[PDB]
Design an enzyme around this catalytic site. Structure first.
Site, PDB file in Angstrom:
ATOM      1  N   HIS A 194       0.847  -1.319   0.243  1.00 41.61           N
ATOM      2  CA  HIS A 194       0.189   0.068  -0.181  1.00 41.61           C
ATOM      3  C   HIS A 194       0.727   1.268   0.072  1.00 41.61           C
ATOM      4  CE1 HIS A 194      -2.726  -2.935   1.228  1.00 41.61           C
ATOM      5  NE2 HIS A 194      -3.641  -2.293   1.155  1.00 41.61           N
TER       6      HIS A 194
ATOM      7  N   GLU B  73       6.240  -1.824  13.637  1.00 42.34           N
ATOM      8  CA  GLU B  73       5.733  -0.529  13.386  1.00 42.34           C
ATOM      9  C   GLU B  73       5.946   0.292  14.830  1.00 42.34           C
ATOM     10  OE1 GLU B  73       4.065  -3.006  11.959  1.00 42.34           O
ATOM     11  OE2 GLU B  73       4.076  -2.799   9.996  1.00 42.34           O
TER      12      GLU B  73
ATOM     13  N   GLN C 261      -6.650  -5.679   4.569  1.00 41.76           N
ATOM     14  CA  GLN C 261      -6.116  -4.344   5.222  1.00 41.76           C
ATOM     15  C   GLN C 261      -6.829  -3.059   5.129  1.00 41.76           C
ATOM     16  OE1 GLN C 261      -1.596  -4.134   4.927  1.00 41.76           O
ATOM     17  NE2 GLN C 261      -2.040  -5.779   3.575  1.00 41.76           N
TER      18      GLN C 261
ATOM     19  N   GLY D   9       3.730   6.720  30.570  1.00 43.21           N
ATOM     20  CA  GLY D   9       4.776   5.610  31.131  1.00 43.21           C
ATOM     21  C   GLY D   9       4.747   4.080  30.639  1.00 43.21           C
TER      22      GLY D   9
HETATM   23  C1  LIG Z   1       2.745   2.026  39.107  1.00 40.77           C
HETATM   24  O1  LIG Z   1       2.291   1.735  38.058  1.00 40.77           O
HETATM   25  P1  LIG Z   1       2.922   0.037  37.433  1.00 40.77           P
HETATM   26  O2  LIG Z   1       1.659  -0.513  36.856  1.00 40.77           O
HETATM   27  O3  LIG Z   1       3.806  -0.395  38.279  1.00 40.77           O
HETATM   28  C2  LIG Z   1       3.830   0.871  35.776  1.00 40.77           C
HETATM   29  O4  LIG Z   1       2.966   1.125  34.890  1.00 40.77           O
HETATM   30  C3  LIG Z   1       5.030   1.824  36.367  1.00 40.77           C
HETATM   31  C4  LIG Z   1       5.079   2.963  35.436  1.00 40.77           C
HETATM   32  C5  LIG Z   1       5.886   4.045  35.896  1.00 40.77           C
HETATM   33  C6  LIG Z   1       6.522   3.850  37.031  1.00 40.77           C
HETATM   34  C7  LIG Z   1       6.628   2.879  37.971  1.00 40.77           C
HETATM   35  C8  LIG Z   1       5.642   1.612  37.669  1.00 40.77           C
HETATM   36  C9  LIG Z   1       4.892  -0.113  35.341  1.00 40.77           C
HETATM   37  S1  LIG Z   1       6.311  -0.854  35.966  1.00 40.77           S
HETATM   38  C10 LIG Z   1       6.210  -2.215  35.454  1.00 40.77           C
HETATM   39  C11 LIG Z   1       7.588  -3.095  35.453  1.00 40.77           C
HETATM   40  C12 LIG Z   1       8.891  -2.889  34.762  1.00 40.77           C
HETATM   41  O5  LIG Z   1       9.808  -3.777  34.554  1.00 40.77           O
HETATM   42  P2  LIG Z   1      11.179  -3.642  34.018  1.00 40.77           P
HETATM   43  O6  LIG Z   1      11.933  -4.929  33.771  1.00 40.77           O
HETATM   44  O7  LIG Z   1      11.268  -3.054  32.643  1.00 40.77           O
HETATM   45  O8  LIG Z   1      11.719  -2.665  34.978  1.00 40.77           O
HETATM   46  P3  LIG Z   1      12.321  -2.517  36.599  1.00 40.77           P
HETATM   47  O9  LIG Z   1      11.148  -2.000  37.306  1.00 40.77           O
HETATM   48  O10 LIG Z   1      12.342  -4.226  36.730  1.00 40.77           O
HETATM   49  O11 LIG Z   1      13.621  -1.829  36.604  1.00 40.77           O
HETATM   50  C13 LIG Z   1       5.151  -2.764  34.662  1.00 40.77           C
HETATM   51  C14 LIG Z   1       5.025  -3.928  34.268  1.00 40.77           C
HETATM   52  N1  LIG Z   1       4.319  -1.460  34.732  1.00 40.77           N
HETATM   53  C15 LIG Z   1       2.896  -1.457  34.258  1.00 40.77           C
HETATM   54  C16 LIG Z   1       2.994  -1.465  32.685  1.00 40.77           C
HETATM   55  C17 LIG Z   1       2.509  -2.484  31.874  1.00 40.77           C
HETATM   56  N2  LIG Z   1       2.761  -2.455  30.538  1.00 40.77           N
HETATM   57  C18 LIG Z   1       3.051  -1.398  29.970  1.00 40.77           C
HETATM   58  C19 LIG Z   1       3.168  -1.061  28.431  1.00 40.77           C
HETATM   59  N3  LIG Z   1       3.410  -0.267  30.674  1.00 40.77           N
HETATM   60  C20 LIG Z   1       3.679  -0.266  31.950  1.00 40.77           C
HETATM   61  N4  LIG Z   1       3.853   0.732  32.614  1.00 40.77           N
HETATM   62  C1  LIG Z   2      -0.628  -6.829  -0.406  1.00 39.15           C
HETATM   63  O1  LIG Z   2      -0.101  -6.359   0.744  1.00 39.15           O
HETATM   64  P1  LIG Z   2       1.441  -6.525   1.270  1.00 39.15           P
HETATM   65  O2  LIG Z   2       2.176  -5.089   1.801  1.00 39.15           O
HETATM   66  O3  LIG Z   2       2.424  -7.222   0.386  1.00 39.15           O
HETATM   67  C2  LIG Z   2       1.144  -7.427   2.941  1.00 39.15           C
HETATM   68  O4  LIG Z   2       0.283  -6.408   3.530  1.00 39.15           O
HETATM   69  C3  LIG Z   2       0.502  -8.966   2.646  1.00 39.15           C
HETATM   70  C4  LIG Z   2       0.622  -9.447   1.246  1.00 39.15           C
HETATM   71  C5  LIG Z   2       0.006 -10.616   1.059  1.00 39.15           C
HETATM   72  C6  LIG Z   2      -0.844 -11.302   1.945  1.00 39.15           C
HETATM   73  C7  LIG Z   2      -1.102 -10.585   3.125  1.00 39.15           C
HETATM   74  C8  LIG Z   2      -0.352  -9.393   3.591  1.00 39.15           C
HETATM   75  C9  LIG Z   2       2.365  -7.989   4.007  1.00 39.15           C
HETATM   76  S1  LIG Z   2       3.401  -9.361   3.222  1.00 39.15           S
HETATM   77  C10 LIG Z   2       4.705  -8.808   4.200  1.00 39.15           C
HETATM   78  C11 LIG Z   2       6.062  -9.611   4.225  1.00 39.15           C
HETATM   79  C12 LIG Z   2       6.027 -10.432   5.427  1.00 39.15           C
HETATM   80  O5  LIG Z   2       7.109 -11.332   5.338  1.00 39.15           O
HETATM   81  P2  LIG Z   2       7.452 -12.806   6.100  1.00 39.15           P
HETATM   82  O6  LIG Z   2       8.959 -12.998   6.079  1.00 39.15           O
HETATM   83  O7  LIG Z   2       6.876 -12.663   7.573  1.00 39.15           O
HETATM   84  O8  LIG Z   2       6.823 -13.820   5.081  1.00 39.15           O
HETATM   85  P3  LIG Z   2       6.975 -14.172   3.470  1.00 39.15           P
HETATM   86  O9  LIG Z   2       6.167 -13.263   2.669  1.00 39.15           O
HETATM   87  O10 LIG Z   2       8.539 -13.701   3.334  1.00 39.15           O
HETATM   88  O11 LIG Z   2       6.916 -15.484   3.373  1.00 39.15           O
HETATM   89  C13 LIG Z   2       4.665  -7.564   4.861  1.00 39.15           C
HETATM   90  C14 LIG Z   2       5.648  -7.012   5.506  1.00 39.15           C
HETATM   91  N1  LIG Z   2       3.250  -7.001   4.656  1.00 39.15           N
HETATM   92  C15 LIG Z   2       2.635  -5.540   4.798  1.00 39.15           C
HETATM   93  C16 LIG Z   2       2.572  -5.392   6.350  1.00 39.15           C
HETATM   94  C17 LIG Z   2       3.239  -4.929   7.157  1.00 39.15           C
HETATM   95  N2  LIG Z   2       2.974  -4.820   8.512  1.00 39.15           N
HETATM   96  C18 LIG Z   2       2.012  -5.503   8.967  1.00 39.15           C
HETATM   97  C19 LIG Z   2       1.951  -5.556  10.641  1.00 39.15           C
HETATM   98  N3  LIG Z   2       1.357  -6.378   8.189  1.00 39.15           N
HETATM   99  C20 LIG Z   2       1.412  -6.289   6.706  1.00 39.15           C
HETATM  100  N4  LIG Z   2       0.571  -7.106   6.074  1.00 39.15           N
END
Ligand SMILES: COP(=O)(O)[C@@](O)(c1ccccc1)c1sc(CCOP(=O)(O)OP(=O)(O)O)c(C)[n+]1Cc1cnc(C)nc1N
Ligand SMILES: COP(=O)(O)[C@@](O)(c1ccccc1)c1sc(CCOP(=O)(O)OP(=O)(O)O)c(C)[n+]1Cc1cnc(C)nc1N
Ligand SMILES: COP(=O)(O)[C@@](O)(c1ccccc1)c1sc(CCOP(=O)(O)OP(=O)(O)O)c(C)[n+]1Cc1cnc(C)nc1N
Ligand SMILES: COP(=O)(O)[C@@](O)(c1ccccc1)c1sc(CCOP(=O)(O)OP(=O)(O)O)c(C)[n+]1Cc1cnc(C)nc1N
Ligand SMILES: [Ca+2]
Ligand SMILES: [Ca+2]
Ligand SMILES: [Ca+2]
Lengths: 554, 554, 554
Positions: free
Chosen positions: C28, C49, C112, C418
């Site tokens: 695309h 991404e 898509q 965070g």
């Molecule tokens: C107080 O809230 P908490 O829930 O503990 C948490 O959000 C947080 C955020 C900022 C500061 C302290 C804690 C954080 S702290 C935390 C553990 C981080 O583990 P990591 O191994 O990266 O570092 P460390 O603390 O061991 O140095 C998690 C999983 N979370 C929740 C969380 C889950 N998934 C994602 C994408 N982001 C997040 N922030």
């Molecule tokens: C026609 O659209 P295309 O762009 O070719 C693609 O979207 C696709 C193509 C054919 C069938 C289904 C999806 C697909 S095919 C494709 C290659 C994936 O490579 P992979 O190594 O996993 O398998 P293969 O094709 O090599 O066996 C990508 C990166 N994309 C676009 C894409 C990017 N990021 C994410 C999260 N999803 C996606 N579908």
């Protein structure tokens, strides 16, 4: 050979069996108007888009069919928003067709563009979508219609950029599809059905409640059938009431509200068959007071979210209400071995009357026409060749008290939205539908409510629609004034008086007949006289304010 | 000690300085009505929430201040959507308070709950938010106002659940905050300012164009200084016209529209300085017909988005327009070496008055009152003590050919929404602002548009607002009728005729003075009598339909 | 002669001065890739991404410029959502370009398509919009960029249907506009400015706080100027820290957090000049504990909503932070008559050290490397030619404690979102920007966090990016494990242990250098060795878990 996108809309509308649109002109939607002219499809053009949107609702509700609204880009669409949200909450199938800014000239700060109409309608529709290609119009129109018509019915918003409407294509290359969707709904599983019927027979004091979904399919003959066969008495929310109209009289419980008393008279049902009726406002929420906590609820709704929302239920079934009733009628055509229920059928009718009479016994007409006596005057003209629309608050609360005791062709009242003023457009669309059926529409509204769309007397006259608008004039926003007084203080009234204005003069200024009346006797003549004529009529009725209906109070 | 969320809201409004609310009652917002009785703050209650929303708008625009609209849950909200959209597109600062369903009882199918009102308003507000706890009210309200008043100004919606508003807290525990936001706006960097001045100094045919942000800041005096110092003609879009009313006439260009023939005659501006003028409907989009392709453009807007949106610019500055006007004035007071420009001022005046003369010459009032002639009659009564509101389409397009030659206190016309019917509520709120300063409001509207809000005659009389409503009655949705005749054909009108209804009659039925007229002299007498009295009036003027205004004829 | 919409995107990007994109291929968006090949514009293609979106952020944050992300229809866009929301909350200017389903073949259930990417990004962007016409691409790209770059900076989502990208137009008919938007921000009004400067001088113990808006404009020389002239000491939230890097050492308060002690040491400021710093998490909310209730706050922010959000302020000004600092520097170049502030400047430096030393005095390295000692090892390599990115929770909390005491080229840490794991893409985009400046990027993350994008070592190797990833490995989700223990019970740990996995082996499997180390001594050699090389490096460091940083605890 080359035709406009607007012509594609209309050809598709026709194929779907549409015969009436409601709207208000703008250039963005002209191609739809021109096409209508050519296929001789009336567009009933109003004085506000709200009233056009409400007209589409009333027409769909009265005719049990699709209503179609047509509005132009920008303010057209924004004035239709109350209609959309009302239809969403009442579950009424309406296609809202709306014009919008051309796709070219997106982001150009242009006239009536720059308003994301789809994003605003998305929270209140079953489907909101913008057409991107003229070629897509038919399949998208037809898809929008299927979404509107299928259970649970609801509003859809099809947005048509000016570009897309004005563009012309090769008419030999495009396919106007059919509307191909079974009118026969989906039925419960036989196990689930038997189970339901088993609980039905083995129980002592059962009722059927009807919801809007039951009026939308209008499976009338199948309703009576299943009711004869089983002798189970039938209640309804406002929207289901006209479904009781062809029942043997003995088994009509009327409005579900008068199920309220049944705790005190110790006769609460042991079983409720909720058919399309949802847990909430009209069914006494999950409080127990209408539908007993101790009762076994069987609920059939197309929305699994609705099943037991507010209260424990004994069996929840997802299906089409209409398709179910049919299933119930076919299953008890195999049976004819059904228990008697004499106590109950009379114990039903008797209590509804006792409540009617208790209001009847109260209520004195000295120095102010009583709102219940006006309601009775109205009830006396209501048979199956009359649609009644109710608006107004106090007005409709009083009206509901006489309504259980009559068999209207329709009954269109406020749903969950409770929006004052929707009555005028509703009744006006209802009357279009009533014309084709020979019925006649009466609108009962408050003096507050009427002022929302009073300009519509003009439309009534231009398109010669015999609606009768009866204004319960108590010189105030009544339910709200009451609230201030009962809730806050006798001394605490503000912003709720309306001590001014001659509505019958407004109507006459628009070219309709206008009566003012202030006694029972003069009201009936005005009503009879109005019924007697094939003209739009206004009847401004002076009505006492401080009487309190049951549904407030205690 | 114990107070409601209602008092909280109101106390905060007071602290922020609001004197008037616009609204229509509902139980859900009653705590706010009560709190306005006590603190004795008037709530102008209307017959339609739309009219209320529009009034808050008219008030904000006429008085360059914050407008506050107050409405109830459900229908109250949905009826407000159009003013909200309208405020959105015109950049007008209005706080919309709305009640909603209680947070307890969320998802119970209860009355007037069950639509997500923030989701609906989000695409058309600067901010939309629902309050979670009573203690949050005063900070959230104050936040709402700040967002509404900062550049560019626009609408804000603050949803206030029934729980939150009914909830009582000890007044001691929550502090009412102050409106800390200095009234002066941000200015350009001195280097940018100089570059602009630099460009401004070396141009043969320079021009300033003002837009809505200039009217909301209202630096009339700074503006004079700067126009006086530099000798550059000033034009304006609709919303900025009253900003030209404190300015010597040798440098008033009038409305932007009349830049049209400057190109169409070898005098196109050299350089154009847009202050809050956006590229779009009012400035001829990207066509270069008003703002020529060949000219150098300095644009000053608070929203980077607008900068050179449709057409390249020499210099794009994001700042407040008022702040910028101040900066310019005071930079210009102190370099006194500005070339004459007498010639240019002449040529600009000649062309503005050439257009005007030319239309006079071709406007015959034989067979029916010509709309240009009707517009001249209104014009002879317009100065700084009059606010003119315009609605209706053809009506405002003819009216607007006279507005350049007069100097109004206010000129409230359609923004991009183009929504017919918003005029009545706008004018009603405008007339409230105007009483504060002893001005008179006149509405000039079409016969189609006045029908939207015809019931505001009742609000006029109950409230004693002497608004004069002038209807240009050409018995059609006129401009749309012309579109049908000109883009499709003579034979092809449907949906656009309105040959019915006595508008004077309607207004009288509501207690207002009605006049009917149909000549120069009779209209002239009606208007003079209307001005002489302190009463609301309606004047219904039969106007020719046929004559095409300049706008169209492009 | 005929060129693709994708070529229009890229030509427009170039004109805007863009030199780097970050993304991940899909068909695309192929036309954008092909165009890049031809204009020799590197697209740094990653393994997720998310990491590409985070790369764009880090690059924008490190380079003080626009970051550009490119992702394909559907899952491309949905994987970019964490990046968008992070950039929204940190106020980072990123253009997210996203592919989408062709407009033709809307509603076709196609690959898509059928995912309203605009509607999902709308709640988290300054502007989200879909292109409807190939011809519109340049003006819309340029408009998207202006929205991103102007104050307050933020993410924008430009959605490009496949159709619209693949369509070819006449290249001689289309206009690639310039980016025409002043880099000089908007300044306060002189009155407001004097008033600020007056409060400044007349007060005893004043501080300056910096927010992200101050790092985005990077008006460095003007910062030092205004600081020399006034001797007012400067604190910063994470994002503002690198702004202290060119200050005379004596007046660097470092991180705003260490303002916490000032209540106890009875030295809370009498005045805070908040410049871009918002009330909330990093500034101790409206609790008083960092910014005193008794202090006079002067706050400058481009968002009027932010002004005094959580706490009464003494003066609120809407302007561009960068443009303001400049105004402040120019105003005190006129002054040179400024009070001494010796007590305070030392009373500032001394207390920040005392807190540093109190941690220093605590903290034993027997049987587990202490998280503070690892932090110190890192601090010892940090000068202005190093960007540090921090991720991880405990990890960054400890790190922040050594960070006030050094002068980094950048400091990129978690904002309000965070979100654990954003560090990897951030640091990777930061290093692209650092390459052009000769700096070097070090990422300090947890063992939890690293696992989000560990696949990126692959990208590091393919594109030869010298990033150094240091993993504070404490075999758990540390802050969350702590929470379970301190908040719920010692016995109550679940789902928070990570006792497994060899990250340096993962890195080596991708072709990067991988160190594991478990003592101070072996860590420094690994670090020095890694710094010494021009290769991607992983350093897995064993680190004690149960030490509690100050910012938890008390
Ligand atoms: C107080 O809230 P908490 O829930 O503990 C948490 O959000 C947080 C955020 C900022 C500061 C302290 C804690 C954080 S702290 C935390 C553990 C981080 O583990 P990591 O191994 O990266 O570092 P460390 O603390 O061991 O140095 C998690 C999983 N979370 C929740 C969380 C889950 N998934 C994602 C994408 N982001 C997040 N922030
Ligand atoms: C026609 O659209 P295309 O762009 O070719 C693609 O979207 C696709 C193509 C054919 C069938 C289904 C999806 C697909 S095919 C494709 C290659 C994936 O490579 P992979 O190594 O996993 O398998 P293969 O094709 O090599 O066996 C990508 C990166 N994309 C676009 C894409 C990017 N990021 C994410 C999260 N999803 C996606 N579908
Ligand atoms: C209990 O809530 P209330 O706020 O009193 C109110 O919403 C209501 C609704 C249903 C039943 C009872 C009251 C109703 S009752 C009410 C007064 C109606 O006046 P009207 O003159 O029509 O009739 P009556 O009561 O005097 O017979 C108002 C203004 N409101 C609130 C309201 C405002 N604006 C719009 C568009 N719709 C509304 N429902
Ligand atoms: C080019 O678009 P048009 O469709 O001609 C129209 O939108 C318009 C035309 C020119 C200028 C501004 C608007 C206008 S002009 C118009 C006629 C209004 O008639 P009115 O009698 O009020 O004045 P006049 O034109 O007769 O003097 C209508 C109905 N419309 C479409 C429309 C419908 N409903 C609402 C709420 N707002 C609207 N603008
Ligand atoms: Ca009433
Ligand atoms: Ca007209
Ligand atoms: Ca960890």
């Amino acid at each position: 050979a080359m035709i406009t996108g607007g012509e594609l809309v209309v050809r598709t509308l026709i194929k779907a069996g549409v015969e009436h649109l409601f709207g208000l002109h703008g250039a963005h939607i002209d191609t739809i108007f021109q096409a209508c002219l050519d296929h001789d499809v009336p567009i009933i053009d109003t004085r506000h888009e709200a009233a056009a949107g409400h007209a589409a609702e009333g027409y769909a509700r009265a005719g049990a069919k699709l209503g179609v609204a047509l509005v132009t880009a920008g303010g057209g669409f924004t004035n239709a928003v109350t209609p959309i949200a009302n239809a969403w909450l009442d579950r009424t199938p309406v296609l809202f067709l709306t014009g919008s800014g051309a796709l070219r000239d997106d982001e150009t700060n242009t006239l009536q563009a720059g308003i994301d109409q789809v994003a605003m309608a998305a929270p209140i529709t079953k489907w909101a979508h913008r057409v991107m290609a003229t070629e897509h119009i038919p399949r998208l129109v037809m898809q929008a219609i299927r979404a509107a018509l299928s259970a649970p019915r609801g509003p859809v918003l099809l947005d048509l950029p000016w570009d897309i409407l004005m563009n012309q294509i090769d008419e030999d290359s495009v396919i106007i599809p059919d509307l191909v969707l079974s009118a026969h709904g989906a039925r419960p599983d036989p196990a689930d059905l038997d189970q339901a019927l088993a609980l039905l027979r083995k129980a002592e004091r059962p009722v059927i409640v009807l919801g809007s979904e039951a009026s939308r399919t209008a499976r009338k003959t199948a309703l009576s059938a299943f009711v004869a066969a089983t002798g189970v008495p039938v209640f309804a929310d406002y929207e289901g009431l006209s479904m009781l109209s062809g029942l043997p009289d003995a088994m009509r419980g009327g409005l579900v509200q008068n199920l309220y008393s049944f705790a005190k008279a110790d006769a609460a049902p042991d079983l409720v068959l909720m058919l399309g009726a949802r847990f909430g406002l009209n069914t006494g929420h999950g409080s127990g007071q209408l539908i007993p906590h101790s009762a076994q609820v069987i609920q059939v709704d197309p929305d699994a979210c609705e099943l037991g929302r507010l209260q424990g239920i004994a069996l929840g079934i997802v299906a089409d209400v209409g398709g179910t009733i049919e299933a119930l009628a076919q299953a008890t055509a195999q049976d004819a071995a059904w228990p008697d229920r004499g106590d109950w059928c009379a114990k039903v009718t008797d209590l509804a009357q006792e409540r009617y009479a208790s209001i009847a016994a109260k209520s004195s007409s000295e120095h102010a026409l009583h709102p219940f006596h006006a309601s009775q005057v109205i009830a006396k003209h209501v048979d199956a060749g009359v649609t009644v629309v109710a608006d107004g608050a106090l007005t409709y609360l009083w009206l509901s008290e006489v309504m259980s005791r009559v068999k209207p062709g329709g009954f269109l009242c406020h749903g969950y939205l409770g929006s004052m003023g929707v009555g005028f457009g509703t009744a006006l669309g209802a009357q279009v539908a009533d014309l084709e059926a020979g019925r006649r529409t009466i609108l009962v509204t408050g003096d507050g409510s009427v002022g929302y769309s009073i300009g519509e007397f003009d439309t009534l006259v231009r398109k010669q629609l015999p609606l009768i608008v009866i204004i319960m004039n108590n010189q105030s926003w009544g339910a709200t004034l009451h609230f201030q007084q009962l809730a806050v203080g006798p001394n605490r009234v503000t912003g709720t008086r309306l001590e001014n204005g001659s509505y019958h003069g407004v109507a006459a200024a628009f070219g309709a007949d206008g009566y003012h009346v202030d006694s029972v006797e003069s009201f009936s003549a005005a009503l009879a006289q109005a019924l007697a004529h094939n003209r739009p009529a206004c009847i401004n009725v002076a009505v006492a304010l401080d009487p309190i209906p049951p549904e407030e109070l205690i």
